[PDB]
Structures are given as C-alpha cells and as structure tokens.
C-alpha cells in the first residue's frame, strides 16, 4: 500500500550495526573508518567493527 518491497537479510547475528535502505535493500555499516582510525584501528566490512592491522 505504502511501498511493498521485501529486502533480503544482510548479516546474521550482529546485524543491528548495519543500516538498510528501502529503495536498494542494501546494507552499510554504522561505524566509519574515521572512527576506528581515531584510535589506530581499521573498520572491517564483515562485522562493522574496529581492528588492529599492525601498528
């Protein structure tokens, strides 16, 4: 009535961290690389979390 556009699940368990659009039904992590880099970290697109590459 207002839209009607079913979207397929993105993640599995830790899906709350993602954001889904009603037009493309795609997902994008909430946290950004900038935030992770703020403490020498790198946002991973698998779980949307910060990780330490080396330094």
| Domain boundary assignment for the chain | 1-55
Counts of helices then strands in the chain (DSSP H, E): 1, 4
Per the CB < 8 A criterion, the answer to whether 25 and 5 are in contact is: yes
Q: How far is residue 27's CA from residue 10's CA, in Å, rounded to a whole number?
A: 6
Per the CB < 8 A criterion, the answer to whether 7 and 20 are in contact is: yes
Q: Which of 45, 42, 55 is nearest to 10 (CA)?
A: 45
Structure tokens at 53: 């590459």
- Helix (H) or strand (E) run with residue 29 in it: strand 27-29
Q: Which homologous superfamily does the CATH classification assign to the domain defined by 1-55?
A: Vascular endothelial growth factor, heparin-binding domain (2.10.160.10)
């Amino acid at each position: 009535a207002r839209q009607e556009n079913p979207c397929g699940p993105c993640s599995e368990r830790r899906k709350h961290l993602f954001v889904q659009d009603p037009q493309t039904c795609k997902c994008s992590c909430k946290n950004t690389d900038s935030r992770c880099k703020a403490r020498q970290l790198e946002l991973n697109e698998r779980t949307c979390r910060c990780d330490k590459p080396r330094r």
